[model samples]
Target: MPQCKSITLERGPDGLGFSIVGGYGSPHGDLPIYVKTVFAKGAASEDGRLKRGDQIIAVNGQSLEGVTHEEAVAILKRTKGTVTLMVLSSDETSV
Candidate 1:
């Protein structure tokens, strides 16, 4: 079965904060899955380019389509510094 991966960003006292969650599978099936918010640093701030509510759907142009949560976390940890994410915000728009 394929796994799902996710990355999240938050606001910290200095600048930006980040967290990673991995190793998750849905009971229903594998094709469609929801990546929940599991990690956070601080409240979202303007400078951080991250809002309080954001959904990370992809990383480094790779879709989080069939990666395990652990795999996702590993990717996040390995790809440190200036990683671009394809995110879905709470307002129903891509950021």
Candidate 2:
């Protein structure tokens, strides 16, 4: 079974300290929104939970499923203080 992660992040003054890619309008085609980069010296870097290639399934309580890329960005951007993310990583090998 694939284990999912619930990551809570404290948004800093600068920003969340990460960027996401995929979803609607993706250059390669429609895809799930996933972690693209985790900036150094940022909130995410300090929290140390998120990693590149981790698919973000939800933010806070809102589901990222079936949401467009821009919609996902807006949801993440608008959130303040603590934000929870439901993530699915590809590292686990199925039994």
Candidate 3:
């Protein structure tokens, strides 16, 4: 079966506390979004679920394929509490 990770986070009062970037230079080569940064003491960082350099495969069960950075951020912002993400770490890309 295909391999991937699913991480669910409790939406913090501040925000998801993470940033995303997209480009062909990424590991997946435009197939997914990359975690540009994971803010400290924030929901994602504090939850310890998401990590820096993690690739975003999906958002709330929705595929991120062909989605732009602005669009991806928009999707995240539109999501309510208890956001879930399909994540793949940079280390996971290799074997």
Candidate 4:
């Protein structure tokens, strides 16, 4: 089974400090939104758990099953206060 992680982040002035890739209409093609990069000066980096290549399954409590890149981006950016992310991490092999 995939290793799913729940990461809670507080939105910063410049945003979450991480960008996303993939999505339904993207070149990656129908894949879930993936964590592109974790910036050094951002909340993601400070949390030290989220890494590049992690697949984001949900934001807040809404699922992102077949959304486009723009839609996913909008959802992530618009969310305020605490943002809970459900992510599937490929790095782990055990439960």
Top candidate, metric TM-score? 4
Per-residue C-alpha lDDT of model 3 across residues 1-95, encoded as one tens digit per residue: 33478888887776888887774445446545877778888889888767766878888988777786667878888887788899776444321
Q: List candidate 4 stretches off by more than 4 Å.
A: 92-95
Minimum summed lDDT over a 10-residue window in model 2 is located at: 86-95
Name the 10 consecutive residues with the lowest summed lDDT in model 4.
86-95
Residue 26 lDDT in candidate 4? 95
Provide C-alpha RMSD values for all models, in order. 7.6, 3.5, 4.3, 3.2
Among these predictions, the greatest lDDT belongs to 4
Give per-residue CA lDDT, model 4, range 15-78, as digits (tens).
9899999889799677789998899889998988889888899999988888899999998988
Candidate 1 residue-wise lDDT, 31-87, digit = tens? 322333323544333334444345456767766667666666666556655566665
Off by over 4 Å in 3: 1-3, 23-31, 92-95
The total of clashing pairs for model 2 equals 0
Q: Backbone clashes per model, in order?
A: 7, 0, 0, 0
lDDT ranking, best first: 4, 2, 3, 1
Evaluated at residue 24, the lDDT of candidate 4 is 92
Residue pairs with colliding backbones in model 3 are: none
Candidate lDDT values, in order: 0.48, 0.85, 0.75, 0.87
